[PDB]
Amino acid sequence: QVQLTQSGAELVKPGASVKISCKASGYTFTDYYINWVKQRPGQGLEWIGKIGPGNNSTYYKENFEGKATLTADKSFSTAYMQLSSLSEDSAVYFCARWGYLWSTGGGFDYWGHGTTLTVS
Amino acid sequence: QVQLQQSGSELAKPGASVKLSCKASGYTFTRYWMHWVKQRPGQGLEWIGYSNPSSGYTNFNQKFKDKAALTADTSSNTAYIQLNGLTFEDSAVYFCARDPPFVYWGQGTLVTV
Amino acid sequence: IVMTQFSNPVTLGTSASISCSSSKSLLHSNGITYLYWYLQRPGQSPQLLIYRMSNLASGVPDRFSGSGSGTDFALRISRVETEDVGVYYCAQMLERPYTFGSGTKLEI
Amino acid sequence: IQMTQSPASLSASVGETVTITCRASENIYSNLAWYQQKQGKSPQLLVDGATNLADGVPSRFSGSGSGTQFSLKINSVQSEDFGNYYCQHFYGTPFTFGTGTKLEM
Amino acid sequence: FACKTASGTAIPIGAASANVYVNLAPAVNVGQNLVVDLSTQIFCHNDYPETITDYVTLQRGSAYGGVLSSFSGTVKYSGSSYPFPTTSETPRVVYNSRTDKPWPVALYLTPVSSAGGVAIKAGSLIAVLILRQTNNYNSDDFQFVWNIYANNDVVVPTGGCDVS
C-alpha cells in the first residue's frame, strides 16, 4: 500500500548543480538496498550506483564515477544525490528498491513517480 | 541423589606426568559427558577439558595441543585425566563437573610443583 | 555487456512472442536462469513482472508465462486487454555491470 | 570473543540493592549463565541462560538483559555470599569466563 | 537457502515447519554406530555471492524423541563431537560459492546392550532440530524447525555384532 515520492520538476541552466531526493515510508528502511536508475528517449535504461544504509558502502560503475554520489539518511528515510561537473543530460531520474530480504522476489520492485531535469 | 568424589592433593617434580581420578555414582556413567575447569588461586577461571566416557574422542581448547591427554575409563566408574609436561605456571587446582548445565561439582585437588 | 532485442504484428487478443538474445548465456551449476522482466505504460511508473524464471510476483494474474532456454528467451501473453499494451523490457545479471534491454513496444 | 565486566568491588552495607553486569562483544545470544563462588566451597548455579531461576535457591534472584548487555539486580541482601560472581556464555567451542567482582556485606 | 534432496525433493523456505524424507543405511563402528548419515542426501546452494553471504547454526533445543526414547548421541557438525541432546551452541559455517556445497552432519547412538535395537517402521519420526540464520547485512534473525521423517525399514544394532 506504500508509495514513493520524490520532488518537484526543476529547470537548471548548464554549469550548475542539481539535487533530487527520494522519500520512503511504511516499512523499515535499514534492511532494503537503494538503487537509482535513469531512462532517456532513444537510449537504454542504466542504473548509477548501489548504496546500503546498513554499511554505507558505495559501488559505482566506471563511466558514471566522479559525476555523483548516493547517500541515505538513517534517522528518517531520504535519499541524496548531487550532480557535479555538468551538459546534455536532459532525462528522467528514478529511485528504486531491492528485494531478497531472506527468500523473496529479489527484483527491482517499488518504482516511484517521474520528474524532469531539463537543461538549456 | 548423586555425588562426586575425587582424589586428594599430589605433588610432582617438574617435567613429569600426573593422574587425577574422578569417581561417580548414582546416575548412569555411560550416558553423560564430562567437563573440566581450571582454577588458579584467585586469578579467575579457565575452561579446558571435554571428554566422553563412551569412547576416547576429546574436544580440546585452542591454547593447548599436546599438553593434555584426557583418558576415560568405562568399567570401574572412574573417569581419569593425565597431564603432560610440568612447569611453575601449571600450579592450580582442577575441578570435576557433569554436563542440564554445570549443576553437580566435585571438591578439587591442590596440584603443586 | 552488449545485448540485442520493435515488435511483430500481433493478432488482436491471441498471443505475443518476443525474444531476448544474450552474447553470453547464463547457466551455473544448479541449472537456474537469471533474467528479469518488466512492464510500463506511458506516464505511469513501471512495475515488476517476472523474477528468476516463471515466478509470479505481487497480485498480477497468472496468465504471464514464458519458456526458458540458454540461447533463446521466450514469454507469452494469453489475453490482450487495454492496459496490456505498452513497452516491455529485459534484464540480465552480468556480474557487477548489470545492463537492461533497449526496449520492445507491443503494437496492434 | 571476550568477556569484560565493570563493577569489581561494590559496598559493605546490608539492605540496599546491588547491580552486577557482564559485557560481551560480537553479540552473543540468549545463552549466558550466572553463578557465584564461595571462598571455600564448590560453586553452585543460580540462573539459566536468558532469565530462568533454577532449582536450588528460594531467595530473591531475578536476572534480565538481552542482546549485548546483561545485568543482575536483587532487591534485598542479607547473610549471603562473601566471595565472587562469575558469568558464563554458551556460544562456541572456546568457552571463556569473565573476571571477578567482590561483594562484602 | 534453497536446499534440495538427492531424490528430487525441494523443501519449503517461507514457513518455519518443513519435512524431509531420507532413507537410512545403518552400520556399526568400533565405539558407536551411525544411524542417519545426512552428509550425502542434503546439500544446499546460495544466491548472489557478490553482496550477501550466509550463515546457519542450530540451538540447544533439539531432541531425539519420537518412537525411540532419548539416548546419548554424537554429532559431527563439520568438526568435533557434540551430544545430540544438545546443551550448547554450534560453531558457525559459511556459504559463499554459487556451486552446490554439502552440509555434513552425523547421528550416532551409545550402546546399552550387546544384543540389538528396535526396528524402524517405514514412515515415522526420528529427530527434531531447530535452525536459525543470520546475514552479512541485516542484524535481525529468523529461526525455523526441521523434523526428519523415516523412509526405510532398517534396524539399529546398538552394541556388538548383529548377525542374521
Side-chain angles (χ1 to χ4, degrees), chain A residues 76-103:
Chain A
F76 63 93
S77 65
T78 297
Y80 281 4
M81 153 173 278
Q82 293 177 357
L83 277 296
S84 80
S85 66
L86 318 179
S87 186
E88 182 56 340
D89 314 288
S90 164
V92 176
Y93 285 169
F94 282 165
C95 53
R97 295 285 94 86
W98 171 269
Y100 182 75
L101 183 62
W102 277 288
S103 290

Side-chain angles (χ1 to χ4, degrees), chain B residues 31-87 89:
Chain B
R31 288 256 323 274
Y32 283 10
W33 272 83
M34 191 66 28
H35 291 260
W36 290 79
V37 171
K38 179 178 179 181
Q39 189 274 331
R40 314 203 42 181
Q43 283 75 330
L45 320 181
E46 281 86 309
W47 191 105
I48 301 299
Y50 195 73
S51 289
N52 187 18
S54 179
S55 67
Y57 182 76
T58 55
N59 187 9
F60 291 167
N61 189 359
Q62 187 179 18
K63 66 93 175 179
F64 55 95
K65 181 69 176 177
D66 301 332
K67 307 308 153 284
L70 266 64
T71 299
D73 195 2
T74 182
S75 170
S76 196
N77 284 316
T78 55
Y80 271 57
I81 204 170
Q82 196 180 299
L83 182 163
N84 290 318
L86 276 165
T87 183
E89 311 316 280

Side-chain angles (χ1 to χ4, degrees), chain B residues 7-22:
Chain B
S7 159
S9 47
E10 169 143 19
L11 58 93
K13 280 73 176 175
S17 78
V18 62
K19 284 186 182 294
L20 297 172
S21 63
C22 188

Side-chain angles (χ1 to χ4, degrees), chain A residues 37 45 47 59 105-109 111-113, chain C residues 36 38 45-46 48 51-52 89 96 98 100-101:
Chain A
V37 65
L45 281 73
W47 67 263
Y59 313 150
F108 272 135
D109 62 358
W111 283 53
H113 287 338
Chain C
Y36 282 120
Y38 303 124
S45 294
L48 190 149
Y51 64 93
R52 312 269 181 266
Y89 284 160
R96 274 321 180 90
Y98 306 75
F100 306 138

Side-chain angles (χ1 to χ4, degrees), chain E residues 29-155:
Chain E
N29 289 10
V30 55
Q32 306 94 19
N33 44 356
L34 73 165
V35 188
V36 176
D37 191 15
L38 283 176
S39 178
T40 299
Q41 280 85 350
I42 299 296
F43 63 92
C44 313
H45 63 87
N46 45 33
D47 291 331
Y48 294 98
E50 302 214 342
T51 61
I52 291 184
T53 186
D54 208 325
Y55 314 93
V56 61
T57 45
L58 73 164
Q59 302 293 20
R60 85 158 192 209
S62 80
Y64 183 76
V67 162
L68 279 80
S69 171
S70 64
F71 300 142
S72 312
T74 296
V75 162
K76 314 177 165 149
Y77 213 80
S78 173
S80 164
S81 61
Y82 303 136
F84 182 76
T86 58
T87 72
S88 313
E89 192 167 311
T90 187
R92 303 163 70 248
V93 297
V94 59
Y95 286 171
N96 57 5
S97 177
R98 279 186 283 234
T99 48
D100 282 330
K101 191 170 182 179
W103 176 50
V105 299
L107 295 178
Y108 285 176
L109 188 153
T110 306
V112 287
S113 298
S114 296
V118 298
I120 309 305
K121 197 170 78 70
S124 66
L125 280 154
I126 299 309
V128 188
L129 321 172
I130 62 170
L131 294 174
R132 64 182 293 165
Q133 60 182 352
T134 185
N135 298 290
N136 193 21
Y137 194 69
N138 197 1
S139 173
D140 305 279
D141 315 310
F142 179 74
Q143 63 185 359
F144 42 71
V145 59
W146 278 354
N147 56 281
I148 317 295
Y149 196 80
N151 205 49
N152 202 357
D153 164 8
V154 292
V155 297

